[PDB]
Amino acid sequence: NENLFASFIAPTMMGLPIVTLIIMFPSLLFPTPKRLINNRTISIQQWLIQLTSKQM
Amino acid sequence: AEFLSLSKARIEAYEKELEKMKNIIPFDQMTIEDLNEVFPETKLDKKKY
């Protein structure tokens, strides 16, 4: 009888706030450049697609 | 007469082919359309791989 765990009883809530903002928001994390050489933060997004476009 | 001029246009078109290659890039980070003359683009569903 050394280490007694505890618990807390509380409702676990998957509520539904305003969704159509939250859906659009991980689009603006990815930009798209109209340039030949890019700016070393799109350039590791642009490489990550090249990989898994060559397996599907 | 003809063969020195038919090679001269082949010298003249080759003199224009390199000078257009200097037109495409003014810098390493230059342009996404000026590099779209030598390296090609096409219509829908050309590049298989």
UniProtKB/Swiss-Prot annotation, chain A:
The chain crosses the membrane at residues 5-25. Coiled coil: none annotated. It is found in: Mitochondrion inner membrane. Component of the ATP synthase complex composed at least of ATP5F1A/subunit alpha, ATP5F1B/subunit beta, ATP5MC1/subunit c (homooctomer), MT-ATP6/subunit a, MT-ATP8/subunit 8, ATP5ME/subunit e, ATP5MF/subunit f, ATP5MG/subunit g, ATP5MK/subunit k, ATP5MJ/subunit j, ATP5F1C/subunit gamma, ATP5F1D/subunit delta, ATP5F1E/subunit epsilon, ATP5PF/subunit F6, ATP5PB/subunit b, ATP5PD/subunit d, ATP5PO/subunit OSCP. Subunit a, of the mitochondrial membrane ATP synthase complex (F(1)F(0) ATP synthase or Complex V) that produces ATP from ADP in the presence of a proton gradient across the membrane which is generated by electron transport complexes of the respiratory chain. ATP synthase complex consist of a soluble F(1) head domain - the catalytic core - and a membrane F(1) domain - the membrane proton channel. These two domains are linked by a central stalk rotating inside the F(1) region and a stationary peripheral stalk. Belongs to the ATPase A chain family. This is ATP synthase F(0) complex subunit a. It comes from Sus scrofa (Pig). The lineage of its organism: Eukaryota, Metazoa, Chordata, Craniata, Vertebrata. The gene is MT-ATP6.
